[PDB]
Amino acid sequence: SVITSEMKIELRMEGAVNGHKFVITGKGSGQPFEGIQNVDLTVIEGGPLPFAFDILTTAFNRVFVEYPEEIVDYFKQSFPEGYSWERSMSYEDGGICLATNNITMKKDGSNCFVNEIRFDGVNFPANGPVMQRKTVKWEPSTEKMYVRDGVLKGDVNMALLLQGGGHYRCDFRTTYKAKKVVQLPDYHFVDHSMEITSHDKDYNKVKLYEHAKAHSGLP
Amino acid sequence: SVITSEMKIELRMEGAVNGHKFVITGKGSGQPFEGIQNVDLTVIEGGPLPFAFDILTTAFNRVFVEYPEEIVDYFKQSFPEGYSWERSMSYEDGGICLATNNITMKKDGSNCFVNEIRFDGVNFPANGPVMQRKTVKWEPSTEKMYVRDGVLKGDVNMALLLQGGGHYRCDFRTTYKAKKVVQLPDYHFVDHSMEITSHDKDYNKVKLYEHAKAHSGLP
Amino acid sequence: VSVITSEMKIELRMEGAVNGHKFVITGKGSGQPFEGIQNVDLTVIEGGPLPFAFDILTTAFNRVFVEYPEEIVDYFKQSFPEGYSWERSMSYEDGGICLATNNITMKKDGSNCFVNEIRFDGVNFPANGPVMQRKTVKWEPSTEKMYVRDGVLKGDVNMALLLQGGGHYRCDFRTTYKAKKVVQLPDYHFVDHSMEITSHDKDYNKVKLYEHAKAHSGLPRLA
Amino acid sequence: VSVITSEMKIELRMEGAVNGHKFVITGKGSGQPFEGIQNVDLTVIEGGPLPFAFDILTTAFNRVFVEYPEEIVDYFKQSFPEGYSWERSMSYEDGGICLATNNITMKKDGSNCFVNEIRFDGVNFPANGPVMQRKTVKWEPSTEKMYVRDGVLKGDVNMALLLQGGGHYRCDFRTTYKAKKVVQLPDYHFVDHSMEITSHDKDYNKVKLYEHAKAHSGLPRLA
Ligand code: NA
Ligand code: NA
């Protein structure tokens, strides 16, 4: 393992949603062993975003999960080479997003992760919560981690809290591919809890916070 | 609330899977405040079952969940009238099951739940783990509970451990309908951990155990 | 050797529940297997008036009644007299879902009657959706896609209910067909369906149903 | 007023990634909008040889090229000169999934050319599935189901790739069509498609593609 308790984050995201192109960059940092990260985002091309910013935030690194010793940590072993993930996000009204992230060490040697993120979304109804920007936050969640074909899969049932109560459900299916041979975990869970801690009125500037911890289910 | 710490369970299940009809009955008991239940099942019609018994076990009562005080307990408030649920189970190879349970107090006044269960499954490939009986157990899981249309919904990502490693994924979507007006909870989670503790060779006699506890996600 | 006449009878019994609501329905009808046409008269004998839209049932009420061109292998007409069965799932877009099965054999008295043992199960329809609120008009005509897997026949169709005051409510079908004996297996092909309720009393306790169905192999590549 | 000639050109640029693998593809072709026929020549200009089956791309490479009978409203031919765009999702049965978009307008120099700006994105294809292992033969012909929602056009089709050594690999399409201006909206109808790769070099850097497409309104109820 090549991970410090204090680490930086740099990221660039390039995407379109319902055809609307956009670019976002972010500088942040976090504590890989506490499972905590912060990031400051800026919409550098394509703002104000027509859609709810919340659909983006999950694309903005499972290195930042506090793993107990008794569970193998696919992610912390993948470095310095890194890993990537690819994800699908099926919303219950037919809307869907794919996203990919390639995560590696900054080439200058320093304590920083570089993230290359692609994000694409189609079929959101013009009148649904995403297009109408009526989302409040993602609820905390529990991702389920298991192995297939010698790589790691994680599936989570996600839910957006809507304005005036009510939830809007989304199913995630992620694949994690380490850039080198690493020890493979047994079935386990990761609790996540992510929230937007600050944003300007049109979400051109957004600060994001996640806390994440792994476990192996009820005794 | 009309619930004792010690309570009996009686149940009858009637179903077909890939057209193969069957009847199962069960006597058991559990501790509604500890979130623990036991049941003894018998296949009284249609045995030996062509398919994996594991697909059945989740149909064999969210009253048996240990709820903390800070979370509203939809289920324990529904009694003595009871509640019902309806569920769908989407397996990743195309196989799918629906099930329903009507839960009420035994009519003789005693400390016993009566369960009327219907179970139907179609489209399991002749060569998949279910038809080939290659399942080992359901992994522990975390159901996600939220309200819609004044009733309670719970969705869980389930996974069967297969012989020689490997998992076989299933998505649950349950609806819970209390038979009277009850206080409605906020979004929360229920950890489940269920296992077959004993069975004869052809699964005509099976003993089942679940432990279940509610919580509200990572601090 | 096929055992099918151009005139054939249909007898059926359907037993189900939808959102927990139990019901039984029987039906007498007849059809013309080579023209791909069938008629049936249904009676709700237990559980009526039905809380849900009758439309969600009608598709469970036999692919023998499809007009097959000679150049397409007919899985169904070869399966007789032994018959076949099917299993189906029906995924509605609002989360509602139904499974159904049918076991189809020749009436035991030797006459030219198909006997249909049908089971039907529906869960998770929103209290306020078109199905529970009974706001459906009809199924649009459709094209089922037939293909082989694991030595049996699969057919998947995009279905759509027309709602009151326009608008459609989508459903995805996934059916499996299992012949009771070894039969010659078809290439990828299509079945057009067009089914409608031709008559019903106010509460749908009595319903007459009509389907016309024809197989084909998709648009010619040349103009 | 429609602005469509019977002879029309096609220019396109597609930019994507699949399983993270970036690529660019451009194409020159032409078609006959009233016969429902189109041709295109594709070049992989960046990212070749492609690790994945080229077949998963070809459907992104214009519903103007459908022969519409007079009795069916043609959403697409009315949308011009301004054009329309579509967004699509493609759900493969092994978990693989692709989204794509196309923005279709008239070439700015006034000539009779459609310009297509296409984006394509694919994730979660198993390393060992037909797509990554390049084991596809062709898409079977299909019937798309067209219906209206929220004042735009939706079309959903059950697609199927024929694999090497028989067997099919299913995919569900869900497309949305958005005209760039107010146009008359159609009733529920169908489009038959039949598309094939007519020519390619060994690594699919160069591919010629042909589609024939015709609309209809489903099997007559009468024999
Ligand atoms: Na903290
Ligand atoms: Na215990």
Size of interface A-B (CB pairs under 8 A): 77
Choose the closest CB to B157 out of A157, A161, A166. Answer: A157
| Chain A / chain D CB contacts < 8 angstroms | 65
Handedness of CA D125, D131, D133, D135 (dihedral sign): positive
Report CB contact under 8 Å: D97, A88. yes
Distance from residue A76's CA to the centre of ligand 1 (Å): 20
**Contact B60/B208 with Cβ under 8 angstroms?**
yes
C-alpha R_g of chain C:
17
| Residue A70 CB burial class (10 angstroms; 0-12, 13-18, ≥19) | exposed
Helix-strand-coil percent breakdown of chain D, rounded to 5? Answer: 0, 55, 45
Distance between CA atoms of residues D89 and D97, nearest Å = 7
Q: Are A157 and B141 in contact (CB under 8 A)?
A: no
C97·B88 Cβ contact <8 A: yes
Which token pair is D82?
């301004």
**Reported resolution in A?**
2.9
Is C101–B122 a contact, with Cβ atoms under 8 angstroms apart?
Answer: yes
Number of cross-chain residue pairs from B and C with Cβ atoms under 8 Å apart = 65
Which class would CATH give C1-223?
mainly beta
Measuring CA to CA, how many Å separate A187 from each of B183, B218, C162? 35, 19, 45
Own/partner contacts of B114-118, CB < 8 Å, gap of 24 or more, are: B114/B10, B114/B11, B115/B9, B115/B10, B115/B11, B115/B12, B115/B13, B115/B60, B115/B61, B116/B11, B116/B12, B117/B11, B117/B12, B117/B13, B117/B14, B117/B15, B117/B59, B117/B60, B118/B13, B118/B14, B118/B15, B118/C17, B118/C121
| Residues on chain D bordering chain C, Cβ-to-Cβ distance under 8 angstroms | 35, 37, 140-143, 145, 147-149, 156-158, 160, 162, 166-168, 170, 172, 188, 190, 192-194, 196, 210, 212-214, 217-223
CA distance C10 to C29: 5
Nearby residues of D71 by Cβ (< 8 Å), 6 or more positions away: D217
Give the CA-trace dihedral at A81, A149, C89, C87, to 10 degrees. Answer: 170
- The nearest alpha carbon in chain C to B89 belongs to C97
User: What are the chain A neighbours of B189 within 8 Å (beta carbons)?
Assistant: 142
CA atoms within 13 Å, Cβ hemisphere of D145: 27
Closest CA to B35 of B210, B215, B216: B210
C-beta separation of B75 from B177 below 8 A:
no
Largest Cα–Cα separation, chain C = 54
Q: How far apart are CA B31 and CA B8, in angstroms?
A: 9
Chain breaks in chain A (C to N over 2.5 A) after: 60
Contact B157 A156 (CB under 8 A): yes
Query: D touches which chains (3+ CB pairs under 8 A)?
Result: A, C
- Report how far ligand 2's centroid is from the alpha carbon of B84 (Å): 26
Asked if D95 and D37 count as a contact pair (C-beta separation under 8 A), the reply is: no
Positive or negative torsion for Cα D176, D177, D179, D180: positive
CA-to-CA dists, residue A194 to A118, A137, A185, D81, angstroms? 20, 8, 24, 46
Residue A22 identity: F
A193 contacts in chain B (CB < 8 Å): 217-219
Strands D152-163 and D142-149: antiparallel
From CA B40, how far away is CA B62, in angstroms rounded? 18
Q: Which amino acid is at A208?
A: L
Q: Which amino acid is at C161?
A: L
DSSP state of A56: H
User: Per the CB < 8 Å rule, is D193 touching C167?
Assistant: no
Within 8 A by CB and 6+ apart from D126, the residues are A148, A149, D94, D95, D96, D132
3-state secondary structure of A102: strand
Rounded-to-integer distance, Cα D41 and Cα D60, Å: 14
Best A13, A123, A147, A174 member to test D by mutation, with max D CBs in 10 Å, is: A123
The DSSP string of B154-216 is EEEEEEEEETTS-EEEEEEEEEEEESS--PPP-SEEEEEEEEEEEE-TTSSEEEEEEEEEEE-
Known binding-site residues of D equal: 204
Phi, psi dihedral angles at B210 (to 5 degrees): -125, 140
Residue positions forming the annotated binding site of D for Mg(2+): 204
Rg of the Cα trace of chain D? 17
Contacts C152 to B, Cβ<8 Å: 126
Instruction: Give helix then strand counts, H and E, for chain C.
Output: 0, 12
Cα of B209 to ligand 2 centre, how many Å? 9
Structural gaps in chain C: residues followed by a C–N separation over 2.5 Å = 61
Contact (CB<8Å) A97/D98:
no
Nearest to B123 among C17, C19, C87 (CB): C87
Tell me the chain C residues in contact with residue D193 when contact means C-beta distances shorter than 8 Å.
219
Do residues D154 and D177 touch, judged by C-beta distance below 8 A? yes
Helix (H) or strand (E) holding B55: helix B54-57
Distance of CA B124 to the CA centre of its chain: 20
CB contact under 8 A, A217 and B157: no
CA distance A192 to chain B (A): 7
By the 10 Å C-beta count (0-12 exposed, 13-18 middle, 19+ buried), C172 is classed as middle
Six-digit token string for D28: 């020159």
DSSP letter assigned to residue B56? H
**H-type alpha helices, A62-200:** none
Q: Using CA of residue C60, residue C63, residue C64, residue C67, what is the dihedral sign?
A: positive
- Domain extent listing, chain A: 1-219
**B66 DSSP 8-state letter:** B
Q: Considering only CB atoms, which chain C residues are within 8 Å of B99? A: 123
| D88, D124, D128: residue with CB nearest A122 | D88
D37 contacts in chain C (CB < 8 Å): 223
The answer to whether the CB of C178 falls within 8 A of the CB of C151 is no
Distance CA B42, CA C38 (A): 43
What is the distance in angstroms between the Cα of C123 and the nearest Cα belonging to chain D? 23
* Interchain proximity A123–D150, CB inside 8 Å: no
* Cis omega (within 30 of 0) for bond into D81: yes
Selected from 3.40.50.300, 2.30.30.90, 1.20.1270.10, 2.40.155.10, the CATH number assigned to the domain covering A1-219 reads 2.40.155.10
Tell me the ligand closest to B64's alpha carbon: 2
**Alpha-carbon gap, residue B202 to B185, rounded angstroms:** 41
- Is residue B80 reached through a cis peptide bond, with omega within 30 degrees of 0 on the bond before it? yes
Mutate to test the interface with B, among A37, A91, A142 (most CBs of B within 10 A): A142
- CA separation for the pair A152, C121 (Å, rounded): 36
Let me know how long chain D is: 223
The answer to whether the CB atoms of C190 and D143 lie below 8 A apart is yes
Nearest by Cα to C210 from C42, C2, C98, C47: C42
β-bridge partners, A47: none
Token code pair at residue B179: 């038979």
